[PDB]
Write a protein that binds this ligand. Structure first.
Ligand SMILES: O=C(O)C(=O)Cc1c[nH]c2ccccc12
Ligand SMILES: O=C(O)C(=O)Cc1c[nH]c2ccccc12
Lengths: 387, 387
């Protein structure tokens, strides 16, 4: 059995071999959203509430978001336009059963095409979405739509939230490294069909969510020991950690109820994250003898403009570190778990296009952060690949 | 980094170092359940439906089940006693928020006691439950109740279902083996608070479940490289697999809706499982030169008496192979994901008191099966420990 364990496991670091992304074909301009949102939900006369929302959108640093929900769909689903005066879970579950796997399939097909190998080689599937409507979970439906082998080992990551873009990489590292030849398809698929609802002056935090959350799905192929000249790695998953900021459970949260998924957000989030991020960095990089955070490439979950500004200030990052992060937030908004993967894609693409020496803007090491309910912080140390 | 990867990972097989279990205090006698169930749900007048249920309970091979739901709680929650006439999800979520973590904590405390080491040594937490009400998921709440370190790495396994007892072992193996020094707390906590509802002539495929499902939580400590004369392993997790039986999506399933979690179990389940179980065995054991299924110890998810009877017949298993499995089903009923861990615990404890040479009834290799929505089959190959 000794030789068995040694041959059963893989040799090198888990590496990202492909990244694919997808979004609903409906771009929503942030500049005109306040009027649209208040009109479709039937609150056009509530000028003060609309003005509060207008202010939130204007300072969001989000230019547009892609949304599965269209005026036509909302018109056919008035219950989703209410706040909580009527139930709407069942209608939302029907939407999720269709849209989450659809976006997941689209992103995965792109990742698989880049990877360039037959899907018969995919051995595992890690699927993540804020919620899933039934049993089987969406991991089953996505595998079915993709025509994966019945024997693909699946793991569904539900109700983890915005930090899960990090969680799935942490999970993928162990699956890929402990199984020789394993090729893990990792997918994050999110849609506001589960969170969209009318405005309420007594729940301004929900109002912030209506201005920031967007739809999208990301897909990665992760595996150790990439085949020379056949597969191409863009990043290596070196080390990971997960931690909870003390006394902050109510900072970010959600509840699955008869009115669908409701969520709460506290203004203290930016401070809470920035006050604990330095320790995440030291614990992650002391072992690599790195103390200058500007010598790393960055990927940060774009939970909100304030969060990015606070982390940037607190860690004294130069104005260029968060360019890829802010770029994604501006073009897609907060797509929950999928965000950091879009940012990784933007990072490697900008690197190749700018003639950088590595897929990490010319730097060797990098850090990826996921933030969410807990308050939870996922840390992922990455290594770029020479170009 | 080469030396880093080697130092980062563990040396041997993931091993179960402790097993603890827990159940609600209310023991429900199966012999008197039909009268109680039809009375509390106001179905006393439906004689034919009651007669059908009586026979189901009488042939269930279940003597009792532990249930969080008591007549008192049910009396205070009439919405939970209805079938689907009124919404009941919110009430159920409140029950789940309290009970799932409570049972999980009880089981985990016992596992940690057996293990005998400081809980500060726990590095990961894999938590499983059919559903979870909010974000954070129950994994967060359980870690909090147990006083685990904020940096414990968590993974919640929700809406996977009855096969997840195998799923969490498959996951624990990679986490334990790819992380030197890692000690993974694995917990499965289930309660019928989410599934209990009145019977219905229009949904007979949902009737059997009310006679079989019970409550319970299991907890294990999994880790590679046990400390000599300090920690003690009872089983090693050697190899795992997961597969889906062709065209059987609707055989076992559930939906989270406004009336709570509804489910369906088709009568074809026993046949579907037995017709695919032989292939699972060949794929798992051919590599170990084992072809005689009676040379292995067994742990089978007790989804129902018929499944067990059919598997035993199909594989021509000796009458002693499923004794532990049937014993757990008889004393606890179908506790979903937790079942197989209760059975593992019974297997090792009996082996030690019966004078067997190993924790696997004197045999070296064994197999553990999880069955659930898909229809999905989880195969886990285990190795016993000498006694
Ligand atoms: O960006 C973050 O940290 C969030 O958790 C925001 C978020 C997006 N979708 C949600 C659903 C429920 C709770 C929070 C969120
Ligand atoms: O024993 C099995 O295979 C089951 O899946 C039974 C079961 C227990 N709890 C459930 C909740 C939803 C769907 C099925 C089950």
């Amino acid at each position: 059995f000794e030789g068995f364990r040694k041959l059963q496991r893989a040799d090198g670091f888990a590496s990202i071999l492909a990244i694919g992304t997808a979004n609903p074909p409906n771009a929503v301009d942030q500049s005109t959203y306040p009027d649209f949102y208040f009109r479709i939900t039937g609150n056009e006369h509530n000028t003060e509430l609309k003005d509060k929302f207008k202010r939130i959108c204007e300072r969001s640093a989000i230019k547009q978001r892609y949304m599965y929900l269209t005026e036509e769909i909302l018109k056919k689903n008035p219950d989703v336009c209410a706040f909580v005066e009527v139930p709407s879970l069942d209608a939302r579950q029907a939407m999720l059963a269709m849209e989450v796997p659809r976006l997941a399939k689209e992103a995965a097909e792109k990742a698989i095409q880049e990877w360039g190998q037959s899907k018969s080689g995919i051995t595992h599937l890690i699927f993540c979405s804020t919620t899933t409507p039934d049993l089987p979970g969406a991991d089953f439906e996505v595998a079915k739509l993709l025509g994966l082998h019945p024997s693909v080992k699946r793991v569904g990551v539900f109700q983890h939230g915005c930090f899960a873009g990090g969680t799935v990489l942490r999970m993928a590292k162990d699956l890929a490294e402990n199984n020789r030849g394993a090729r893990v398809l990792v997918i994050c698929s999110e849609t506001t069909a589960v969170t969209f609802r009318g405005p309420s002056e007594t729940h301004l935090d929900s109002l912030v969510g209506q201005a920031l959350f967007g739809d999208g799905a990301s897909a990665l192929i992760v595996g150790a020991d990439p085949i020379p000249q056949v597969e191409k790695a863009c990043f290596e998953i070196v080390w990971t950690a997960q931690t909870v900021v003390p006394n902050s459970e109510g900072a970010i949260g959600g509840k699955v109820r008869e009115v669908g998924l409701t969520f709460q957000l506290k203004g203290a989030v930016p401070d809470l994250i920035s006050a604990n991020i330095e320790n995440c960095m030291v614990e992650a990089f002391s072992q690599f003898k790195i103390s200058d955070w500007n010598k790393l490439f960055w990927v940060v979950h774009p939970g909100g403009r304030a969060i990015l500004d606070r982390v940037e200030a607190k860690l004294n990052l130069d104005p260029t570190k968060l360019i890829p992060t802010r770029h994604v937030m501006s073009e897609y908004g907060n797509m929950s778990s999928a965000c950091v993967h879009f940012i990784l894609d933007q990072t490697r693409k900008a690197s190749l296009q700018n003639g950088c020496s590595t897929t990490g803007e010319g730097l060797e090491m990098g850090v990826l952060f996921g933030f969410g309910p807990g308050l939870t912080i996922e840390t992922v140390v990455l290594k770029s690949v020479p170009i």
